[PDB]
């Protein structure tokens with residue numbers, strides 16, 4: 300029944316689901332602590348993305364495993380759009396590139412500058428986040444699994460429809476619509492690249508719970524009791 | 526920037542590199558021990574053609590040589606992989622590295638970390654199959670990889686280059702949409718398919734980063750920036 304929402308309904312649901320902005324509480328201890336607290340809010344947000352909770356819990360966890368760092372990154376880029384040259388990790392934690400860290404830092408700044416140049420809108424941003432959640436694990440998962448992937452692709456199609464709808468209501472021509480859609484989805488591959496480097500770094504720590512476990516994510520999802 | 530969509534597709538089709546073979550060296554028969562050497566030599570020969578292909582992607586040679594090399598340094602493995610996936614599309618469960626080098630997953634299990642990447646490639650091939658990806662779409666996607674993968678990791682000249690690259694990417698988008706419009710897809714089907722194709726590029730980037738990790742774990746003597754520049758920096762004496 301999530302696949303029966305109108306585009307306007309999809310947008311409203313996604314705007315209403317947005318997580319709060321957290322505050323920060325060693326720069327790296329601070330950033331780890333912030334990320335760890337944001338994760339919980341991200342899960343609550345994921346559960347409100349239309350179509351997401353129709354998946355099995357097992358598949359919801361896999362999608363969160365694959366997507367969470369990309370989702371933290373795109374949130375950071377969004378918060379940082381109005382702060383050229385700086386990254387707004389939290390309202391009390393604005394860092395510039397002077398504060399292997401600088402490479403990712405510079406890439407995030409470039410992404411934030413690209414969003415600024417494009418005049419990325421909030422309604423577009425929340426569609427892009429939902430695409431990351433559904434797309435980032437869809438290629439790295441039986442009859443049941445195939446049905447799940449099929450559902451994922453149907454939801455992704457509806458989000459594409461919603462993005463085009465937003466662009467059309469903003470007065471873009473059909474050409475500008477498809478050009479903008481393409482520009483936004485190409486940025487997602489850069490966001491994937493940044494996440495890949497950060498995940499490589501986390502795994503290299505060989506430290507039990509630095510990468511959120513399946514069990515931790517599952518606990519956060521707070522499964523029904525029946 | 527002046528080309529029509531039809532002329533863009535024709536240029537990209539005309540620029541396509543050939544399908545290369547693995548060596549037929551009777552002194553070097555295929556085995557698990559020789560496999561990496563055969564695959565490295567194949568990749569090395571493909572890279573030479575890839576350089577000459579890139580120079581034929583409309584808009585690419587308008588860039589500085591320095592920026593051309595950066596784009597190739599950032600894209601070459603993705604381009605090698607998407608070509609592999611394309612060659613494998615019609616062979617479920619196999620990777621067609623060359624017509625005489627068709628491997629299955631159990632042959633992948635020879636090396637550490639190789640089967641994981643192998644399965645990601647197979648999944649991409651399966652997705653191409655499900656979408657019934659067309660050759661004209663494939664050549665558009667490969668050019669997008671070339672222009673997009675390095676554009677976010679690059680002065681007034683740099684601003685002009687990035688503007689140019691974004692204009693060329695926009696023309697390839699127009700070209701992809703035109704291919705689907707000519708075929709008869711509805712507008713809704715056109716936007717849905719464009720998005721489906723472009724989302725696959727995130728997966729290809731992911732695979733490229735895993736593959737880079739794997740190649741570096743080989744501890745052999747990856748094309749360097751200096752090496753790619755030597756290859757792209759052609760003279761005009763021919």
Ligand SMILES: CNCCOc1ccc([C@@H]2c3ccc(O)cc3CC3(CC3)N2C(=O)c2ccccc2)cc1
Pocket residue numbers: 330331333334335337371372374375388399400401402403404497501508509510511
């Ligand atoms: C999950 N438990 C284990 C910790 O994983 C962590 C996850 C994220 C981060 C932060 C963080 C925090 C909040 C945010 O909203 C976004 C980010 C982004 C990020 C990865 C880019 N990061 C950094 O520090 C960073 C690194 C190098 C260059 C610039 C920034 C820290 C640790």
Ligand SMILES: CNCCOc1ccc([C@@H]2c3ccc(O)cc3CC3(CC3)N2C(=O)c2ccccc2)cc1
Pocket residue numbers: 564565566567568569571572602605606608609622638639640642643646736739740747748
């Ligand atoms: C570039 N200079 C030095 C060469 O580095 C090389 C570049 C490419 C490869 C092959 C190769 C060859 C041709 C092709 O078209 C594609 C590929 C794909 C690939 C990169 C993923 N590869 C592997 O073996 C591999 C590994 C794990 C899983 C599956 C495949 C070997 C070495």
